[PDB]
Every structure is written in structure tokens, then in C-alpha cells.
Amino acid sequence: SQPDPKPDELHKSSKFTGLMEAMKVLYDDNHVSAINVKSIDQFLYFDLIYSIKDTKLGNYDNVRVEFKNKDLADKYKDKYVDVFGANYAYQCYDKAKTCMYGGVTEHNGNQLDKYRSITVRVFEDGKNLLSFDVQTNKKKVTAQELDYLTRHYLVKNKKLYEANNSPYETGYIKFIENENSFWYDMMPAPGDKFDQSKYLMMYNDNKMVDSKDVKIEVYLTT
């Protein structure tokens, strides 16, 4: 449904002179993952606040999901959900609280027996040289979760974002569900700055897909 990237539409990493590590921390080993949690508070009319704890490093004790509109926050307000996504900030109104976008799926009637695998084909400058699987136990899973899994594998194995500079010039991730498909630009906007919240704001739609039918294709050009 979404048209594929037009010529020169993708972001060039060479036109980005900031620190690539900023984007790297978004898809490193650390993210927000919670199972069977209900909202506890609400700051603004398009967010929800969850008592999600950082068992890893103890950084955050509360997490604030931001949505694109109000119907999403009012939707998942009183429902027990699972949370999965990339956190970016540490704010106050004790431990601090971190923020993210979307990544909320309903719990009941959404868990699978075994781990469902999704195959990811990677194309470097045109040729399919790499292909790996990403697992999930969710019938309906956010595109943010699959994107974070894919980009995480690419972080650790192919050095997609390193601390300084990037080996890859352009790159976008493509989710194809049956007939329809959409894509996301993986490279930061040009300039010396990089706003984590503005980049991650693309996830505020809470776009979900079916793990049985979705297919993932990553396209990178050096």
C-alpha cells in the first residue's frame, strides 16, 4: 500500500555529522519489555503511565507510552497489555521515568504456544547476502518490536550503527503483510543533531501486524 522509497527519498548517513551512537543506543541490548501490565496514571491525554521496572540496571521505575492520538490512549487505558519498545529519555514528574512510543499489545488471546519465527532477508546494494530469523510469542505484534529485533541483530552482527560513522549509506526496513506493505527509514535526518524522540515518534501509531503472515525485508546501500 505504501509506495516504496522514491529516488533520493532515503536519508544519507554521510549527510549526518552527529554522533551515530545516539541512534545506536535505541537498538542495543536495552529496551522496555513488560508482560501483563495495566496503566497506573496518565500525564497527558495521549500518553499512558505504566509501573514497569528496570530489573536490568534499575534506571527507571515508571514508563510513559506516547500515542499519535487520543483514541489509542483511551483504548489501552484500562486494558492489561504487554509493552515492548525503545526508550529514549529520563524525566521527572525516587527513581526517574523513561518515555517511549506505542509498542502496546493486548495480553489476553494474544500469546502463542511456541516461539513464532519471522524470516528477515537483507540486501546489500542489491544482492541478498544475509537472512536471519526473529522470534515472538505474539499473534499481533507491533512493527516497533520486529524492527527493534531486526535492527538489533544488525547492530551486533553487521555493525549497522557504530559509535562513529556508519558503513551503510542508506537503509530502510519493509514490513509486508499479505498484499499490503509499509517501510521505515533507518538512517537519521541530515545535520549535526539527532532528536531521539522525533525519530522514535514514528512508532506512536501502534501499528501491529500478524506474526503468521508478516515478512521483513531490509534494504541497505553502501
Residue numbers in the entry: 2 to 94, 108 to 236
Which statements did the authors publish about this structure?
We designed a vaccine candidate, S19, with reduced TCB–SEB interaction by introducing the following four mutations: N23A, Y90A, R110A and F177A. S19 was originally designed to make fewer molecular interactions with TCB than wild-type SEB, as a result of the removal of key interacting side chains. S19 maintained a similar overall structure to SEB, which is required for its antigenicity as a vaccine candidate. However, S19 exhibits some structural changes in its flexible-loop region. Although the entire structure of the loop region has not been determined, owing to its outwards orientation and high flexibility, the N-terminal region of this loop is well stabilized by intramolecular hydrogen bonds and by a disulfide bridge between Cys93 and Cys113. The Y90A mutation was the sole reason for the observed structural change, as depicted in Fig. 1(c). Tyr91 of S19 moved into the original position of Tyr90, which had been stabilized by hydrogen bonds to Asn60 and Asn88. The disulfide bridge in SEB was broken in S19 owing to the ∼8 Å translocation of Cys93 in S19. The interface areas between TCB and SEB and between MHC and SEB were decreased 27 or 14% by the mutations, respectively; thus, the simulation reflected the loss of binding residues. The number of simulated hydrogen bonds also decreased from 10/10 to 8/5, respectively. S19 was originally designed to have a lower binding affinity for TCB, but structural determination revealed reduced interactions with both binding partners, TCB and MHC.
Staphylococcal enterotoxin B (SEB) is one of seven toxins secreted by Staphylococcus aureus, and is classified as a bacterial superantigen. SEB is one of the group II superantigens, a group that includes SEC and SpeA. Superantigens in this group bind to T-cell receptors (TCRs) in a peptide-independent manner to generate an abrupt and strong immune response. This 28 kDa toxin consists of two domains, domain I (amino acids 30–120) and domain II (amino acids 127–239), which are composed of a β-barrel structure and antiparallel β-sheets, respectively.
